[PDB]
């Protein structure tokens with residue numbers, strides 16, 4: 337679990353969005369596993385606007401942060417799950433690092449701010465959904 341709180345927006349994994357997220361929907365994209373909902377309170381986070389390929393992510397299944405080197409956002413095949421059919425997930429960055437399904441929502445940050453959230457992984461890999469291209473998150 338986990339979310340990004342920026343301005344009057346909450347960014348979560350689309351497969352973990354709640355009834356309240358869907359009732360206050362701003363934008364969603366099944367291909368990216370992202371959903372953004374509106375909030376009444378101002379949020380705690382800043383979004384990175386950069387091309388960093390190194391950063392640090394939070395891993396809930398270890399209660400620890402890990403440094404990673406990650407690939408540039410791209411289209412990557414993701415096997416079928418209870419939430420989606422087998423498909424290509426876009427804007428996804430891969431890294432070598434521990435992750436389990438419940439780690440989705442953990443934030444990846446670089447020196448410029450939030451880069452994305454955990455969305456895929458397994459077998460010593462972790463995949464992050466990028467948010468750096470969503471310029472409207474800041475206005």
Ligand SMILES: N#Cc1cccc(NC(=O)N2CCC[C@H](C(N)=O)C2)c1
Pocket residue numbers: 351369414417418419420425435436437438439440454455456457458459462463
């Ligand atoms: N093992 C593992 C693992 C680690 C981090 C994350 C995951 N992700 C998942 O559990 N899913 C199932 C729900 C939809 C997700 C999607 N992006 O299509 C993929 C697995």
Ligand SMILES: [Zn+2]
Pocket residue numbers: 384385386387388446447448449
């Ligand atoms: Zn950066």
